[PDB]
Amino acid sequence: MGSSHHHHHHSSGLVPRGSHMTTVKLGDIKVTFDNPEKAKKYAQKLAKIYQLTVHVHGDTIHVK
Length: 64
Hints:
The chain has one helix and four strands, in the order E-E-H-E-E. It is an alpha+beta fold. The protein has one domain. The longest helix is centred in the middle third of the chain and has 14 residues, at about 35-50. It is globular, with a radius of gyration of 13 Å. The relative contact order is 0.24. The PDB classes it as de novo protein. Keywords: de novo design, mini protein, DE novo protein. It forms a monomeric assembly. Solution structure of the de novo mini protein EEHEE_rd3_1049.
């Protein structure tokens, strides 16, 4: 066997539907990405680099 049963839990980073650029606020540094998809995928790396964490709240991802 080898099946990871992925299911959505209550309350997540609920991004609004529509083609819109996400404002990823790093420590002072203002980053932006075309899509919330790529935004969170690069922001989790920026969190690991700068030793911070990802706070995804709507169209704003602040790397706390």
